[PDB]
Design a binder for this molecule. Sequence first.
Ligand SMILES: Nc1nc2c(ncn2[C@@H]2O[C@H](COP(=O)(O)OP(=O)(O)OP(=O)(O)O)[C@@H](O)[C@H]2O)c(=O)[nH]1
Ligand SMILES: [Mg+2]
Lengths: 95, 49, 360, 52, 47, 27, 661, 124
Amino acid sequence: KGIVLEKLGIESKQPNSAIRKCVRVQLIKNGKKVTAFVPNDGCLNFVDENDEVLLAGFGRKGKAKGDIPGVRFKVVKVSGVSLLALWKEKKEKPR
Amino acid sequence: SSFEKQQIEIRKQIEQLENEAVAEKKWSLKGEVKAKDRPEDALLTEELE
Amino acid sequence: KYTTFQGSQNFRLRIVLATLSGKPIKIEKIRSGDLNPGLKDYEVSFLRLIESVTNGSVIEISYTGTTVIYRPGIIVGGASTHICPSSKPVGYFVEPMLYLAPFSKKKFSILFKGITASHNDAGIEAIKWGLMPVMEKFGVRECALHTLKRGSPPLGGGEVHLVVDSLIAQPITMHEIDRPIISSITGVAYSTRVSPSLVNRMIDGAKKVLKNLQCEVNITADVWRGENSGKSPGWGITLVAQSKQKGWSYFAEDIGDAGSIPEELGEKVACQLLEEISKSAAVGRNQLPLAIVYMVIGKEDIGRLRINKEQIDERFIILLRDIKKIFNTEVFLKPVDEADNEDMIATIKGIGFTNTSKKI
Amino acid sequence: GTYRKRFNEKARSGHMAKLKELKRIRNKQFTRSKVSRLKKKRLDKFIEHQLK
Amino acid sequence: DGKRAINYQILKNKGLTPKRNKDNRNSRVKKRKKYQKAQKKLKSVRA
Amino acid sequence: FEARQRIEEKNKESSDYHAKMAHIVNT
Amino acid sequence: ERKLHVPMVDRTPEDDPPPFIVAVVGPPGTGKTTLIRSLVRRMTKSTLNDIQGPITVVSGKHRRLTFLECPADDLNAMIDIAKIADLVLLLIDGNFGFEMETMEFLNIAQHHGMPRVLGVATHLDLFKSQSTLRASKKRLKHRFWTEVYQGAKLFYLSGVINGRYPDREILNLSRFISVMKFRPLKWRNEHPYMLADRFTDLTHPELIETQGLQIDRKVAIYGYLHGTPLPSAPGTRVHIAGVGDFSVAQIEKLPDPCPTPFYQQKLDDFERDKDKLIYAPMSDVNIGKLIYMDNISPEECIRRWRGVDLEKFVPYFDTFEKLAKKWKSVDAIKERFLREMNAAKKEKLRAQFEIEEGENFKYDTWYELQKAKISKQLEINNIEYQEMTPEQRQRIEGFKAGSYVRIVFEKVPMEFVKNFNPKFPIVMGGLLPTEIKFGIVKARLRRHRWHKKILKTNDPLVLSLGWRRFQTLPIYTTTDSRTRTRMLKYTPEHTYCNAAFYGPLCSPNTPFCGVQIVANSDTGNGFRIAATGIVEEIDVNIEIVKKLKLVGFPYKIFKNTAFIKDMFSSAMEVARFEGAQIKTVSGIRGEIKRALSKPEGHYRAAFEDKILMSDIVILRSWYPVRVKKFYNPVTSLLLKEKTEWKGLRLTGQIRAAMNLE
Amino acid sequence: QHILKNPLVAQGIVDKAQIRPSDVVLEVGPGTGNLTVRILEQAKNVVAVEMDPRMAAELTKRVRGTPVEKKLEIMLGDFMKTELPYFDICISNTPYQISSPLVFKLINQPRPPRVSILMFQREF
RNA sequence: UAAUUGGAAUGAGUACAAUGUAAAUACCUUAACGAGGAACAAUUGGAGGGCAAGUCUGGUGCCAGCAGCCGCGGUAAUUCCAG
Ligand SMILES: Nc1nc2c(ncn2[C@@H]2O[C@H](COP(=O)(O)OP(=O)(O)OP(=O)(O)O)[C@@H](O)[C@H]2O)c(=O)[nH]1
Ligand SMILES: [Mg+2]
């Protein structure tokens, strides 16, 4: 689990860039704060600040044209619901 | 009673707004305007960018 | 409608409070019994500063000029400048921005010019070592006061620079019930456009007073000369007694002008510092309005600060009655049960306050 | 796992008394917070320093 | 009735799934068509 | 003057964010 | 790592917490009066009838429950109750299915903060076969599991044999809503709120008769305070939802009229409720004190306690020579500064070690650390209150939750009293210092995924935010890649535009929710929630920028140089713009260079390629638009009918009712 | 002659010195001013001691037009033969053959410094 | 390649009934209904393609790159990559 501490690249002009997609997240077990990817850049609207993101390993098999060394996690569930079920508009985020 | 005065002036504001809102748009809230459709000098008194 | 205050007494405090709480106030009969009634020049410039950092507010001044009607807006901030009029030093306008700074939309970067020393108002070592550490206890991380040029009375022309970086949501709730133990004494001793024997003689007098008490004593001599040293000579001192464990400070400053035998001035300030220490517990007698206001605007939570009974004086009673007029916040003074002295714990329940003008 | 850490030990008192005895015998063969340790060590260093 | 019964969409709740064929429903039908299509190719190259 | 001040803001913000993601990872 | 959470603060009291509010909601015919009737019959053995208003019933040694049959239709009442409710018996027909009101309330609850929703399905005795019944039960359960979490249990109630439900099931509901722990939400633990058991207007008949009945009357309202301490001085502000925005004139703590048996047990251990289990009134059956005495001067106050300006900074010091003699020997201040005798050294040194660097030395996770700091603070509050003589505790804490309180307003509009009926909830809410200012808010929002049509710029949107419902005129902006704020003219169909509007402020990061029409006449079959957002920042000015392109033609063509007609009409028009950019509609770049004088608006312009004559030049100007300042609060329960509050009409609607394109 | 190329140990060396805004830094063996300019920002007046007038000329060329142009003196010659003025902290990179003289010269100053950040060989 | 249409087939479901069973429920059996968008509305993933009177970045011109649910109008109206 983790707390969304802030967003990164919210003022980055170049859209869909990787630094646009990355939020900065504090974990609740340690206290250590890391960075986390997010699929589908529109899904930055779903995470706000003090959400509970549930992070999973990013575990990427390969590295693309303009990627980032350093993002190692990825956001799976934002405050209970799951980002595939908000982006697909099945459920919606219970505040 | 003060509630009726407050809604009479609310209906004033609403009636004016509707009468505006269905009405034909002022030129400077369109695209593709000429000097034909507009009146003259209306880019000197306006301060666009 | 308007909360309504009388008199010209403690102007800046009511303007700051009416900006924090956000309730329009109205001050009336402002020296109206006096020869030329109204606001002095510096009070108008202070209102100009307040209007400059708060987008949205509205100030009106009566026809004669003896009734101010203030309706606050949100705090915003920015970077700007200010030209302090000749009668009051820059400390007069630095201090209310100390109250108001950590709660704005953007940072403060304000550039003051003018005189930078006086007898009455705050210095530049006063604000640095006397009221930045209280602000740092209450959760303000990164604040600083860059001296660029140091003026002096009567001409001045100095300029200082208030940069405040951290924007907290609300101050923390600060429990403190113990008399701090003083562990050092530092202090600054400065002089502009004079020969450097003065600073050494002030340090001589001070260290002769403090040559009998059991902590280390050091004093940064600071001799400006030339082109950033301003336009007129002067000299002054500040002594800070510094408790390192918890981060508290008690300090006493003064300046001096043509005629003062500087050994006497240093001896004076050392005696005043000892006096201040003996009438204090966890705050000096003059850092106390800042800490009381930062307790009031905390979050909804009892905060306890210990005070000596000698600090209970007329300025205290005035301050608390002004808080109870704006905020509606009483202040429960219970006594302690150490039977060696008559300290009083002062517990204040914070109002529920945030910084509602940040952005997410 | 004889001398483990059980979840609640006030409610297991007869047990731990019995285990104390077992340990006493089996290791009478040999008998015949670390922040409190760090605090004690630093205090004793300090006292030695001040006397020197 | 006076009853505001529910939509179709907010019953079966399939928002934004893309639109596939009428042949992902029935695997037998899809493999049938793909066999009789990729048998045409082998009736041109094995000429 | 606008276009310049935008360029220095944009450069600083971008570089600092990349520096934070260089500040985390080989910890 | 299922356990860990964002830490939050509780602020429910520990001595006497108020009753939990149990809304019971659902469509019109679904049987939500038999539910409340039979729940109360099980929990007091005392059957009612004609239930209206809130109803407080003791259930246990401690729990008190405040039932509230929410009205069926009115979307205003559902919005109110969703803000304040604390359990929701969301009761859905079983034979019919879901119905659109159940879905609407569910989404209103999900945005403002979701209370404990527990669903019960009735009309299950209308099925004729067990296979139809059993599959339908499973199917409703799975849809309800989508809306609420998974495994959330719903209850199935058969027939109404005697005007009330069975006993096995109703006994299960009673057990389950009497073991349940509630979640610390956000909006409810900063604002005091109050649900009103009874209500009386307090004027003479004399002012009515001698002033012709019109005047806004003075009114006192009674009920339980939930949420946070409502401070114990008059004049604080209040929003009475669906009425307006008042300021309280007098408050007073009554003795509460439904005590738990635990409470009476502890009260009879001062002096050393067998049938009055239900309370349904809306239906029928010293220097610290010396500082705060205003009429005293500060100086005299000091003089009594023993036996000037603050504008100067330096305090008042004594005279120099008195100090110089006084502070020669510093012995008086001594203790502010840092075979048997050996122990005396080591005690001196022990205390010095504790002082000097004995700070650097003072759970398993980081969530338990935070909750331990929070709970340490909460008990410091508790301890320092319980040294306060209960008047003083009342003066600086101020009527914590659970207190029964009478408060009384004055200048309350006439219609509120004439059009009263107990079935609609009146719900007092406190106000923070921000939410009384007015300004423009910059929020972000999307069309709500089930709403059929996209919105429009400047068509009114009744939205609820804080305790308020008000109708505004939003204006939806994109952002042109973090440069400017282009004014969109619609809502994107599947994403988040921003919006700006003029309304009461509220703090950043606050979720709101907005509808079209709330009038129960013209509703139809469509879903009704229409936008969901959070408010992102707060100010008093924004500038929005509509893209406006000037279009003109060429008439004389060189190589790499053209002459332009029809865009402008004068000379100084062109002279304002020497250095603009014109792009061909076909797509080559260019600019304008100089003005021709004898032709009146014609001029000369440069290009990168030789222009084709049919090409057309456009300049990309940026007109500034600005928000309107409409604000029309609903006040839905001052009307005679309360199920139709109408305001501005949508642009398509006023074109339909005026028969025009 | 070696050059501390790392642009991140340089800042850390500087800010550990805790330079106050009223200090006189002696800064012995400045090199090409990779390190110096930070000290110029944080101190009132810097006194750099140098032996290579090539470096001295380039270093004084570095500060031209810069606001800190007037807060830097340069003293030439052998370090172990000058008379150092009063100075109030000391920051040093100088090549290591003077590592043992330097230390005792600082200890035997009249009015010695208060803190000095020195670079040495690991075994030294 | 199909995009209209021609009749034949059947059970998911509903159901007299009988069987089942301690009693039911369901299966197995079966009157009567029950298929054209057979709307009686299969899914989960990843790869490509185009989308300009749009935006943004860089440059040795008309370009490139990012991207494109954001354009000039219009939302009971647009009936659009039939979709
Ligand atoms: N057969 C059957 N009838 C029911 C059931 N529930 C309620 N009813 C009947 O339907 C009617 C409606 O019940 P109410 O108690 O009015 O419930 P309600 O939701 O308050 O209805 P309104 O008063 O119209 O809001 C009652 O007369 C009940 O007898 C049920 O589960 N089965
Ligand atoms: Mg009913």
